[PDB]
Design a binder for this molecule. Structure first.
Ligand code: AGS
Ligand code: AGS
Ligand code: MG
Lengths: 451, 451
């Protein structure tokens, strides 16, 4: 009823992802009635939108085994859009695309051990030649070259974000191999799907932050000024920083992060300077979000704080907050676990005058969190997460994450005699048999702890 | 059950050390069935791993008087491996060894008083000539030269850590004699065998620190992020610093020590600089451990601390803790005797979110501690350490060490009339007759003190 903003809404161009029959990295398939509905001719360059602000440029073709409201794409495209089979995606016409001038690609390290020969000659040239491939900056793509398959990242493009790779396009693969861990920590990146039992609050954040920045016209038309300071509060480990990361990755707005301790660690004056630089940067760049994490570190009650520099910072912040005129289109978000220790001046009208309580999860919420945490864990049949959700009365997300870590450590302990600390590598069979059992969770539960 | 990680496990190449029949420094002996089991031909160069990350390179020969699961090696090899008879060692094939280019050896000072003549001509040349000896950097080896025996240290090698000494190999013995006290303070170096009544906890430290650094694949395969901040706590004198020294000497990881007071002793800003330098160094160097000893010195509750530089340091630390991304492979360990005085921000998820309680030893633990302390003491038949363990209720390791020191002082007092404070040297007979009696311990016990 209030939650209405979160609802997906059906559109002509909003389609479900199905497995591809055409296994090319550049190709997406649609049913013929759907192509006509969207005025898409065969072989047109299209823009697809996935989760966490991710995009891919593809060339569209007609398929008959494909349903009307479905789209077919391989793993490579699904990866780039950070989507799995069943997720909804946007499809957009894209006749804007320039022919590429210069691109910069690099291989992923672990998929490149043994023989250089020539990476461009063996792999990239046969992949691109006369194919007129659309590629986007940040794409990870797989190429076979007789022997095996190498993954490459698009690091740079000379036409702004995306281009067509013509014979003209100079293909550079100069630098060091891109580290596996870099790109896995890039897949790691937090989205709204990684945040559990916070539906009501996520809806509030989209209302107060996302809505007025993407559609200022609504608030201006109705005759209402958008609130400009939103403060997330709640007990330690409920998900504030996690939401911070999610927003950063999920928004159309330019995002600027400030960590409380990161500011207070700096020299006298050089801290006030970074604060100004943050606000000046946000004002300069588009509709923007400034996230002040751990606000109580920078803005405690001016009455009860010893240092002159510490008092000067609170004053610096207040001045910045009021320094933004309406037409700046900058919203300031902040998170704390002790809201009662922040200077009341900052919680006045026009400053942080809106509050979102990220509280303790209910039984239902805990279940969401356990499902979110265990999505990469190997679990057994007998593991009942609903059971674990109910037995965790005082637990917040951080306690549940830790519980999952200790359940997993127990399963490692059960496999100990087949493992030793001294050998270089762990046995292959032992690695595959690793499942976290219900019994492990009951051991984790017996050890667990509140607040 | 939980202690499973500490268990040693039987392997084909894990052998018990027996006394050698072949008394050459370069030679180890095995039974003929065991050499076939490990595909080791006669006279192959082998790598031996001992305690405290110690290694020796030997040439392997077949022995018949030797049992299947035993290895024969002299005192020189046992010293270099820091093992006594009955300890288990690894044996590894080693066909990698290059011929040496340049080696640097130096004599141990107290074994070299009177006549230089020439050390290479009299000692080293006849020891190495046509022998093709494997040697490792850091090896201490004894050589006889007609008259007497001189100990030498391998200070440097031109092929990286170990090489074969061929006729080509230039043998330098240039510098000052290596000091006895330095090499005895090197044997002094603390390992896991020097820490008593702490089995459960050592298992915890190996789980949380050693296992994720040596085997990150396990945690990544199971789908779990390894905890990155471990805090040792407990009353004064329980063995925290002792464990820190043990870990430093025992791990495969690069180790960096930070002492609380050592940091706070520095000029404003130059202390923050050293904290950064420690993290940048640890990030630069392999899998790494950073040990912040006496944490409560640098990180007290920001709420109750007077100086601006003191507040700025806690902020500097928090930022660094969060500054490590998952893929850094750096665990931070810390020790304190007042855990409740640390800023709670530091003890949150992602920071020092794991705790190891080094508490008061039980009766069994005290006995372990007494056995570890008195391993170099001269004791009498009537000394019952089990009796002493039982009468020491409130005692921690530091109290027990102190008790041992006072017991020994009492035995010195018993010998006083045959000693005087004025004479240059103490009589030789008086030195040998020194034994610490049970009576001395009962005097020590009479004087003892809790907490
Ligand atoms: N509601 C939640 N949904 C999913 N995961 C969560 C949630 N809350 C906590 N977690 C997990 O716990 C971890 C720590 O939570 P944080 O986001 O750091 O909590 P926090 O609210 O920022 O705590 P403070 O106030 O900084 S002590 C996250 O990385 C998540 O893995
Ligand atoms: N568990 C133990 N096993 C063997 N010796 C110990 C043990 N605990 C203490 N000792 C001895 O007592 C000495 C002092 O112990 P420390 O390791 O300094 O204690 P600590 O826990 O670091 O105390 P704080 O908190 O720094 S006052 C050590 O050098 C050991 O000789
Ligand atoms: Mg947080």
């Amino acid at each position: 009823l209030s939650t209405a903003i979160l609802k997906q809404k059906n559109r002509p161009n909003r389609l479900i992802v199905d497995e591809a029959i055409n296994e090319d990295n550049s190709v997406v398939s649609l049913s013929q009635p759907k192509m006509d509905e969207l005025q898409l001719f065969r072989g047109d360059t299209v823009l697809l939108k996935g989760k966490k602000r991710r995009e891919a440029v593809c060339i569209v073709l007609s398929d008959d085994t494909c349903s009307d409201e479905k789209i077919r794409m391989n793993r490579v495209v699904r990866n780039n859009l950070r989507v799995g089979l069943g997720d909804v995606i946007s499809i957009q016409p894209c006749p804007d695309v320039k022919y590429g001038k210069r691109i910069h690609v690099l291989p992923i390290d672990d998929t490149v051990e043994g023989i250089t020969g020539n990476l461009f000659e063996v792999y990239l040239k046969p992949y691109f030649l006369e194919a007129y491939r659309p590629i986007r900056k940040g794409d990870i793509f797989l190429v076979r070259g007789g022997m095996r398959a190498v993954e490459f990242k698009v690091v740079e493009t000379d036409p702004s974000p995306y281009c067509i790779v013509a014979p003209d396009t100079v293909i550079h693969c100069e630098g060091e191999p891109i580290k596996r861990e870099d790109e896995e920590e890039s897949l790691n990146e937090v989205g709204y799907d990684d945040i559990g039992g916070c539906r009501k609050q996520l809806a509030q954040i989209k209302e107060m932050v996302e809505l007025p920045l993407r559609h200022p016209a609504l608030f201006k038309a109705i005759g209402v000024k958008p609130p400009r300071g939103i403060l997330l509060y709640g007990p330690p480990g409920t998900g504030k920083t996690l939401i911070a990361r999610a927003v950063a990755n999920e928004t159309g707005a330019f995002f600027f992060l400030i960590n409380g301790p990161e500011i207070m660690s700096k020299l006298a004056g050089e801290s006030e300077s970074n604060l100004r630089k943050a606000f000046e940067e946000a004002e300069k760049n588009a509709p923007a979000i400034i996230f002040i994490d751990e606000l109580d570190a920078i803005a405690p009650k001016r009455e009860k704080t010893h240092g002159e520099v510490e008092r000067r910072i609170v004053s610096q912040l207040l001045t910045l907050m009021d320094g933004l005129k309406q037409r700046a289109h900058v919203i300031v978000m902040a998170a704390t676990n002790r809201p009662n220790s922040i200077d009341p001046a900052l919680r006045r009208f026009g400053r942080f005058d809106r509050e979102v309580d990220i509280g303790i999860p209910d039984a239902t919420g805990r279940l969401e969190i356990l499902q979110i945490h265990t999505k990469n864990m190997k679990l057994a049949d007998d593991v009942d997460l609903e059971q674990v959700a109910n037995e965790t009365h005082g637990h917040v997300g951080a306690d549940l994450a830790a519980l999952c870590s200790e359940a997993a450590l127990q399963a490692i302990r059960k496999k100990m005699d087949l493992i030793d600390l001294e050998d270089e590598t762990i046995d292959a069979e032992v690695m595959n048999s690793l499942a976290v059992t219900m019994d492990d969770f009951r051991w984790a539960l017996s050890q667990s702890n509140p607040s």
